[PDB]
Amino acid sequence: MDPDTFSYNFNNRPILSRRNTVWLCYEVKTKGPSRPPLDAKIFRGQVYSEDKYHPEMRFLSLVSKWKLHRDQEYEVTWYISWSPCTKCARDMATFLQENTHVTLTIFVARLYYAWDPDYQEALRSLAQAGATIKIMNYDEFQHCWSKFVYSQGAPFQPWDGLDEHSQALSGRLGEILRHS
Ligand SMILES: [Zn+2]
């Protein structure tokens, strides 16, 4: 019941920050067909302390594990915030360039700017492979809320300016590559 892992890191207005010890939540679905009548094949998971590598190459084993159901293209959303997903982002373009028929939706939070002008540009190259890099949005939480939170399946809306914080961080994402 209630938000367990989402209130842990996906939150934007915590008591006093200092709460982002997580890797990244990802959902493995198909490209973007019409609304399916059944439950479809939506697999939502994370990295945890089981695999030393992020979902760069070890994530493909799940794609290989769920066989006997090939359609055409698969879409994967990646909710990341504070972890080694920077070099992972370079390896991300490697999983996206080796699959090609897969779409990548990488999300970044950061919440702590220091000096990563080339990082944002490298994400542009990972996006050229066929991925999407954008700061966490109220829509990513409203979605992850239904995917990872319970709350009886309630329509979770913005709280103390969550969408205001998602666009405030998105402005910092463009300044990471602009204002160095
Ligand atoms: Zn990663």
Side-chain angles (χ1 to χ4, degrees):
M1 265 200 96
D2 274 280
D4 205 78
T5 315
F6 170 102
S7 246
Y8 201 119
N9 174 85
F10 278 106
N11 60 274
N12 256 268
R13 25 72 80 189
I15 300 176
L16 225 144
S17 306
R18 223 256 228 114
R19 224 117 214 101
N20 51 80
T21 183
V22 77
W23 303 103
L24 73 97
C25 142
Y26 72 98
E27 57 117 83
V28 216
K29 268 162 95 138
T30 172
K31 221 187 111 275
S34 281
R35 288 221 219 113
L38 283 112
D39 284 88
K41 214 169 113 220
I42 300 136
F43 210 103
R44 296 151 281 199
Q46 251 216 76
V47 185
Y48 275 82
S49 196
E50 285 159 81
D51 203 291
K52 271 206 275 262
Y53 223 53
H54 240 202
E56 303 147 87
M57 57 106 205
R58 49 82 59 233
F59 154 101
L60 283 108
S61 300
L62 312 155
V63 183
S64 196
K65 248 249 78 241
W66 315 330
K67 228 80 215 176
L68 229 134
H69 203 83
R70 63 223 275 121
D71 278 81
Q72 233 152 90
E73 277 98 64
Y74 228 57
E75 181 263 288
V76 214
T77 314
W78 272 21
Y79 291 132
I80 302 131
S81 173
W82 207 241
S83 73
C85 210
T86 294
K87 279 115 80 156
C88 179
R90 318 188 67 75
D91 219 80
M92 241 165 264
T94 258
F95 155 74
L96 212 195
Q97 80 174 246
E98 70 159 287
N99 202 299
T100 87
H101 267 44
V102 73
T103 21
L104 252 190
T105 339
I106 287 145
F107 269 50
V108 170
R110 195 93 163 255
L111 231 302
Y112 266 117
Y113 184 77
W115 214 89
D116 275 275
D118 189 74
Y119 176 45
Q120 241 282 275
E121 302 183 271
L123 287 160
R124 300 292 238 230
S125 293
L126 157 281
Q128 300 241 95
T132 301
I133 295 82
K134 84 178 293 118
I135 287 303
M136 65 225 288
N137 257 253
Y138 157 66
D139 202 88
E140 96 96 292
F141 307 107
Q142 109 171 230
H143 187 274
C144 218
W145 183 269
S146 286
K147 299 308 147 136
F148 262 111
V149 185
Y150 290 100
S151 170
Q152 209 227 81
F156 146 68
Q157 249 204 97
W159 40 41
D160 209 78
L162 203 186
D163 197 289
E164 218 301 282
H165 222 74
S166 286
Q167 67 194 78
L169 279 174
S170 201
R172 298 293 253 274
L173 114 80
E175 282 200 87
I176 276 161
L177 143 149
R178 272 186 99 256
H179 287 84
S180 180

